[PDB]
Write a protein that binds this ligand. Structure first.
Ligand SMILES: [Ca+2]
Ligand SMILES: [Ca+2]
Ligand SMILES: [Ca+2]
Length: 181
């Protein structure tokens, strides 16, 4: 792994943590996960029943990540610890990290039809990136939609996640993920 490779990977990890920090305090906490769910519910005009299910799902992810009440990790620490951890992983641990990431797929799938639609992916991207234009969100969606069938399936999401977490050189995939480093 080169110095340029490591720096690229850190840029990706910084993008991830800055996008997740929707509260804008320079930390990652369960408040961030809750706000992303709340914003998705507004953007996607979810019913009150679906909005609460989605809020609970995001908080469950916060719980799985260890973001208990009062726990806050700086975006700087989060990003550094991510590049360090992920770049040390061998094959079996990589595979598990990728499967684990699919919990985020399920969160974004708010109608639970097992696919991520354009509305669902757009709601997610604009929840974490309020500055991202409708056009750019569509571009990001089209990047993940490998077969151009109008939905992001779990296979498409998974191969994208793998490149985002472990990729060492620039791709359109990694840019669409959050998207825009
Ligand atoms: Ca935050
Ligand atoms: Ca769906
Ligand atoms: Ca597709």
């Amino acid at each position: 792994i080169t110095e340029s490779e490591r720096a690229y990977h850190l840029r990706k990890m910084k993008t991830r943590m800055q996008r997740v920090d929707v509260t804008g305090d320079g930390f990652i906490s369960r408040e961030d996960y809750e706000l992303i769910a709340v914003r998705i519910a507004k953007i996607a005009k979810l019913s009150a029943e679906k909005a609460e299910e989605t809020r609970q799902e995001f908080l469950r992810v916060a719980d799985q990540l260890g973001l208990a009440p009062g726990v806050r990790i700086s975006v700087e620490e989060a990003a550094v610890n991510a590049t360090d951890s992920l770049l040390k992983m061998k094959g079996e641990e990589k595979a598990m990290a990728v499967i684990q990431s699919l919990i985020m797929y399920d969160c974004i799938d708010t109608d639970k039809d097992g696919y991520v639609s354009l509305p669902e992916f757009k709601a997610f991207l604009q929840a974490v990136g309020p500055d991202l234009t409708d056009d750019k969100a569509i571009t990001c969606f089209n990047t993940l939609d490998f077969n151009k069938n109008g939905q992001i399936s779990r296979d498409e999401f998974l191969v994208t996640v793998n490149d985002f977490l472990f990729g060492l050189e620039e791709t359109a995939l990694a840019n669409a993920f959050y998207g825009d480093l």
